[PDB]
Amino acid sequence: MIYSKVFLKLHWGFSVVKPLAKPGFYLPPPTTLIGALSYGKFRGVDNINYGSPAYNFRNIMATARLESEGVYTEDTGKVYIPNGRLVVVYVTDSISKEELEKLCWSITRIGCKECLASVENVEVGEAKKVSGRVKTRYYFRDTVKVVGRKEFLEYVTFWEENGYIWGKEGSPVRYILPITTYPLASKEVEVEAKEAYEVGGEYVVFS
Amino acid sequence: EKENIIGRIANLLAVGFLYSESPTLVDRFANALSKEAVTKVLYDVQRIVQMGIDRSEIATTTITDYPAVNVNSSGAKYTVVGYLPTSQDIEDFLRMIEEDVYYARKAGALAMSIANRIKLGS
Amino acid sequence: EKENIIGRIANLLAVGFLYSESPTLVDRFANALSKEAVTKVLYDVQRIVQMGIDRSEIATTTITDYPAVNVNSSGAKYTVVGYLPTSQDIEDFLRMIEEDVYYARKAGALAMSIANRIKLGSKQSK
Amino acid sequence: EKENIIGRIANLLAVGFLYSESPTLVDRFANALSKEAVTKVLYDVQRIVQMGIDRSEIATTTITDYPAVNVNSSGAKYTVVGYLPTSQDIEDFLRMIEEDVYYARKAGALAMSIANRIKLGSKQSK
Amino acid sequence: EKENIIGRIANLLAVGFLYSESPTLVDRFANALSKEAVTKVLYDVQRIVQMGIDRSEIATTTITDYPAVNVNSSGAKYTVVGYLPTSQDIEDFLRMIEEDVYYARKAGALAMSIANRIKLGSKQSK
Amino acid sequence: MISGSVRFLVNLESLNGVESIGNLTKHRTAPVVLKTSTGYLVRYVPVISGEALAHAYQASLVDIAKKEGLPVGSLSSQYEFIKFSTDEALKIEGIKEPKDYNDARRFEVEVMLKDVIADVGGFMYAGGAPVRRTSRIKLGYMIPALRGDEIPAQLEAQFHVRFSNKPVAIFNVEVSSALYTFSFELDEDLIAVPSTFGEKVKGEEELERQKAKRVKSAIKALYSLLSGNFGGKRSRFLPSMKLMSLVVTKTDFPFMPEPAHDDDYIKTTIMRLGKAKGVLNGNLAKAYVINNEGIEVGEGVTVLSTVEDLVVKLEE
Amino acid sequence: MISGSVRFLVNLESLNGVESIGNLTKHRTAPVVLKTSTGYLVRYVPVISGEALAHAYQASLVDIAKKEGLPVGSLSSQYEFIKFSTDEALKIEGIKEPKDYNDARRFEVEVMLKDVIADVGGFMYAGGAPVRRTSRIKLGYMIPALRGDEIPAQLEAQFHVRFSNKPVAIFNVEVSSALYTFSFELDEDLIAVPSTFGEKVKGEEELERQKAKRVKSAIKALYSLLSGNFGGKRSRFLPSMKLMSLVVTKTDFPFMPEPAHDDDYIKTTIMRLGKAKGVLNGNLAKAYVINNEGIEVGEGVTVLSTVEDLVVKLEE
């Protein structure tokens, strides 16, 4: 199981609108993170035999977190965090280290066209699996238990990869975000969980 | 104490509006996006109140006892219930504005509510 | 220390206003867009205060003890609580104005607040 | 060094004002719009100080040690803290005035502040 | 070179003032409105200095080395630091005066500054 | 590809308005958080959206293309960029709708030959068999630099009156003056290339012949954006723009420069260009820099003086 | 197109006013961002709105058109430029409102054959079928030059009294002095040409006949703006104006001269004009320079003496 870390510098922020008034999300879903990675190999093509040129990277695990302060504003929901930093962790085993590292440098935007994001540095390595009590900052699933004080937790709804095809709605999956609503920031939460990969001290929780 | 300061600033804006018969200073205060706009209104409203004081058309009083300000815009007699801000309230309010211009919008909304209630009763 | 300097300049402007019975110097100070306008008012207000000192109509005192300035004008008696600025306060204030003329508006707003509160209290007692 | 020169010119103007009991030279200095008016005041104030030196009514001293100038006028005793300007300070100040007459206003404002503080303290002790 | 000429003329005026104990020639020089008044003072001050030279009461010296002029007057000893003007300095200074009489006021202001500083130091040591 | 980061200085400007309240026209602002020793401060700062820039770019491209004889759509000749979206739009131009998925590519090519703007700008057709085309030019929001501990931007309201001889006439307009920075991307290599898999359809030879002219026109259209011909209210509120710093990179692989929010953003992007070429096995990498505020640049960069030289070098 | 940059020196000035406080009449002020050796700063400086300049230009155009026999609207005959915005103006002039979109062109022509002001300065009609026409002359705010570290501008207040034998009369007036700069741009290739897309409508032949006279009048109307006949409070506060520098460029392609903020803005704009003509495939580019301050100009540039010569050359 290989892991990779990437540091992104945002220009003005990201904007993803909720499916089904056009409110937006607080943090990008894993689908956008996988699509950004897939952009490095499928550049120039928009329809493959027809739902998306991204129904092939569906089994790559990804998480992301903030490192600065921002504000969520509806004026079409947007998340303004200019000059901020984003840390993205990719965990997978489908491809070797070289291919993941090459695709990691080829990220251009997160969400829509205006949400450009440069790349500052990357790291590649081998991860280890643990199950003891850990502290994490990345968001995880709803079914994961919590031992600490419930004070900085929010509930969101994301979709599986089934939504990659047009004319079809993805399955609804609940997610828990360790985020402060105003101002926008990230906080640490202690979880027990069953599977956690150590990617450099900042344990990533998946189930 | 922040709410008391905002309330005293709202009383000053309401007295200035009732005396001048103009909403323009309250509109400028409620739409302020900088400390410059807020501070300019705080001067201009106090300058209007100073003229009313010199003419004896604005005076402090008590009413059943609560502190109040009587305003004569001619026969149109108005009474605003509460205190006017102190120099320390203006200084502490300007410090609140340097942190968050929202407090100018809050004071403007309160001032317009005071003035509207008094104009309706009159 | 910047707030103390601004407060002492505001006391000088308030004393000059109460003694002269004219807002014109405070109006000029609060509307200043250049160091020239600010410096001209700082001279003219101190020149008014100097005449009040020579006539013994402006004097430093203590009141219950806080430092204060007594002002006699047209048979009215006023008391401003606080110190007048030093030469160093004027010089440091002029340096603050050379960086940002905003400090003249802050001092003018404070001076008018001091004068208004004193005039209101004096009219109520009469 | 420009501020030190201005401060020493302000001390000279304050000594001349306290000794002569006349603001006229400081008024002329602070209202100057030409190098002619500034230079004329710099001569006239030094000529007044020269008479006080010859009468032993103006003397340099130290006070707790800071340099100071003692001034005796009409039975009043005043002490201005600081140095008087050198010939080089007058020449460098005149060069500053040839660039910007603003420095005469700055020195005049400082001189009046020094004189006012000393006059207030002397009246309070009496 | 113009400032050096003015400084040497100021040294001549200061030496003449300290030796004669009279400000009258410096007053005439600083108030001059014509080349006639300036030239008359330049003669009269040099005539006073000539008498001091003939009496050996005015002499050139070096002091720690800077050029200086020792002046003995009424049992007082003074030392002016610098050179006296040359004939060429007087001629070039008169040409400067024919263009602008301002240079006489500048030299007079410098001369009075030199004399005042020396008189103050001499009174303090006594 | 071509990437660019540009810094602007604008005074007494009102280009992008927002919803009017009462008798007032308001400017577009966004919230930012600034760090202080005491804590954090939330401030509202004026911005300019990325749609007006796209509209100006498309209008300039239309104007340039109609001079060289390149095909232009009927509704795009008029400055109405609805594009071939619904059936009513296709009816005026005279294009039959796609039959099924397998024919989709053909439809695209036909559209791609009847309107240049639909090619470079991109189009979307909603219906039973949708067709897509991503824009070849990518633009971002114009936000003033958050540099140091001070935001160099303001926003005031101005009062205006109309004169009449029979009073029975008042409005307010918001004006601003900031120091803007914006970045953009363009891919001249993908111009005149279809974006749908399948078998080649008759008519691609015309696209191959027109590729060079379309690329030249697309590159030329950047001059209007880099010269300041965007936004509105230019009849009575004409702004005063000026160029301060500009970095343009031409490569053969994906790359973008650093945002122009710091005082030293050219050295970083040059070093990152070198590092990225080291890893992605690139061949071409060139950087052109225009400097007017006297910030540090680095070594290994050609220094220009104007924007016209930049366009000439890009075309060459 | 004709694009110009002009520098003026004005002393003891008050032509533009804003809301008054007490007995004080205030002068319009705006924030400006200026660059110094220590970085960037924000200052408050008196300015003059461009609407006064537009009103003066339109009044001069009305006078010239009336003198030369060109048609002038009934409401526009009096110096009240409401144009055709409201229904009362249409009723007074006697023009039927448009019925649907297809009739809009006709309405525009009816407006365009009656008042030259509507043709040149544009107009707006709001209703079931809105009609728009952008102005053919573009101006901006009058801002003093932001040169060096010190702004060459000053503002103060003045004291005035009214005499009376029976006291029962005191006011203050704001007066400013500065070195103003401003730029302008007018497109004479679109004068007397309809802007709304549609079919041919009877009455365009008269517009084609009068096009030359309309263009000549529009060019002549710039003399008032270039001379100094604008602003209010001229009865007792007549200002002292003196031209210092002027650059005028005539091109067949879009172009914008450099703002008059730096001492060297003529050589730069001439070089930029040459390179822009080279790169944009133009066919006409001429420049005229009036200099009275002895600054650098360049080589191969026509030098004039007054403004009337420039107007005559532009007309010819």
Curated annotation (Swiss-Prot), chain A:
Which CDD domains does the annotation name? Answer: Cas5_I-A
The terms under GO molecular function for this entry are: RNA binding
UniProt keywords, alphabetically: Antiviral defense, RNA-binding
Per the record, the domain of life is Archaea
Q: Does the keyword RNA-binding apply?
A: yes
Please provide the Gene Ontology terms (biological process) for this protein.
defense response to virus
Report which residue ranges the record marks as coiled coil: none
Asked whether the UniProt record includes Magnesium among its keywords, one would answer: no
Q: Return the similarity comment.
A: Belongs to the CRISPR-associated protein Cas5 family. Subtype I-A/Apern subfamily.
Binding partners and assembly? Part of the aCascade ribonucleoprotein complex, minimally composed of Csa2 and Cas5a, which binds crRNA. Other possible components of aCascade in strain P1 are Cas6b (SSO1437) and Csa5 (SSO1443), while SSO1399, Cas5b (SSO1400) and SSO1401 have sometimes been seen weakly associated. Csa2 is probably the major RNA-binding subunit. The Csa2-Cas5a-crRNA complex also binds target DNA homologous to crRNA, probably forming an R-loop. Purified aCascade forms a filament about 6 nm in width.
Alphabetical list of NCBIfam families matching this protein = cas_cas5a, CRISPR_cas5
Q: What else is known?
A: Cloning was done with strain P2, while interaction experiments were done with genes cloned from strain P2 but over-expressed in P1. The aCascade complex was purified from strain P1.
Role: CRISPR (clustered regularly interspaced short palindromic repeat) is an adaptive immune system that provides protection against mobile genetic elements (viruses, transposable elements and conjugative plasmids). CRISPR clusters contain spacers, sequences complementary to antecedent mobile elements, and target invading nucleic acids. CRISPR clusters are transcribed and processed into CRISPR RNA (crRNA).
The protein's name in its UniProt record:
CRISPR system aCascade subunit Cas5 1
User: What species was this sequence derived from?
Assistant: Saccharolobus solfataricus (strain ATCC 35092 / DSM 1617 / JCM 11322 / P2) (Sulfolobus solfataricus)
Upper lineage ranks? Archaea, Thermoproteota, Thermoprotei, Sulfolobales, Sulfolobaceae
Q: Which gene holds the coding sequence for this protein?
A: cas5a
Curated annotation (Swiss-Prot), chain B:
MF terms (GO), sorted A to Z:
toxin activity
Give me any GO biological process, just one. defense response to virus
Pfam families cross-referenced by the UniProt entry? Cas_Csa5
Keyword hit for Manganese? no
| Superkingdom of the organism of origin | Archaea
Note the InterPro entries from the entry.
Answer: CRISPR-assoc_Cas5 (IPR010157)
| Keywords for the protein's UniProt record, in alphabetical order | Antiviral defense, Toxin
Q: Does the keyword Glycoprotein apply?
A: no
Q: How does it assemble?
A: Probably oligomeric upon overexpression; does not interact with a Cas5 (Sso1441)/Cas7 (Sso1442)/crRNA complex. Forms dimer and tetramer-sized oligomers when overexpressed in the absence of CRISPR loci A-D; the oligomers are probably responsible for its toxicity in the absence of CRISPR loci A-D. Part of the aCascade ribonucleoprotein complex, minimally composed of Cas7 (formerly Csa2) and Cas5a, which binds crRNA. Other possible components of aCascade in strain P1 are Cas6b (SSO1437) and Csa5 (SSO1443), while SSO1399, Cas5b (SSO1400) and SSO1401 have sometimes been seen weakly associated.
Function (record text): CRISPR (clustered regularly interspaced short palindromic repeat) is an adaptive immune system that provides protection against mobile genetic elements (viruses, transposable elements and conjugative plasmids). CRISPR clusters contain spacers, sequences complementary to antecedent mobile elements, and target invading nucleic acids. CRISPR clusters are transcribed and processed into CRISPR RNA (crRNA).
Q: What else is known?
A: The aCascade complex was purified from strain P1.
Recorded protein name is CRISPR type I-A cluster 2/Apern-associated protein Csa5-2
Q: Give the organism, scientific name.
A: Saccharolobus solfataricus (strain ATCC 35092 / DSM 1617 / JCM 11322 / P2) (Sulfolobus solfataricus)
From Swiss-Prot, chains F, G:
Q: Which domain of life is it from?
A: Archaea
Keywords for the protein's UniProt record, in alphabetical order: Antiviral defense, RNA-binding
Molecular function GO terms recorded: RNA binding
GO BP terms: namely:
defense response to virus
The consequence of residue 160 to A is: Significantly reduced affinity for crRNA
Query: Is the keyword RNA-binding in the record?
Result: yes
Extract the InterPro entries matched here: Cas7/Cst2/DevR_sub_I-a/Apern (IPR002764), CRISPR-assoc_Cas7/Cst2/DevR (IPR010154), CRISPR-Cas7/Cst2/DevR (IPR052681)
Q: Which family does it belong to?
A: Belongs to the CRISPR-associated protein Cas7/Cst2/DevR family. Subtype I-a/Apern subfamily.
Q: How does it assemble?
A: Part of the aCascade ribonucleoprotein complex, minimally composed of Csa2 and Cas5a, which binds crRNA. Other possible components of aCascade in strain P1 are Cas6b (SSO1437) and Csa5 (SSO1443), while SSO1399, Cas5b (SSO1400) and SSO1401 have sometimes been seen weakly associated. Csa2 is probably the major RNA-binding subunit. The Csa2-Cas5a-crRNA complex also binds target DNA homologous to crRNA, probably forming an R-loop. Purified aCascade forms a filament about 6 nm in width.
Its biological purpose is as follows:
CRISPR (clustered regularly interspaced short palindromic repeat) is an adaptive immune system that provides protection against mobile genetic elements (viruses, transposable elements and conjugative plasmids). CRISPR clusters contain spacers, sequences complementary to antecedent mobile elements, and target invading nucleic acids. CRISPR clusters are transcribed and processed into CRISPR RNA (crRNA).
More details = Crystallography and cloning were done with strain P2, while interaction experiments were done with genes cloned from strain P2 but over-expressed in P1. The aCascade complex was purified from strain P1.
Name the PANTHER family on file.
CRISPR-ASSOCIATED PROTEIN CAS7_CST2_DEVR, PTHR37459
Q: What is this protein called?
A: CRISPR-associated aCascade subunit Cas7/Csa2 2
Organism for this UniProt entry: Saccharolobus solfataricus (strain ATCC 35092 / DSM 1617 / JCM 11322 / P2)
Q: What is the lineage of its organism?
A: Archaea, Thermoproteota, Thermoprotei, Sulfolobales, Sulfolobaceae
From the UniProt record, report the name of the gene that encodes this protein.
csa2b
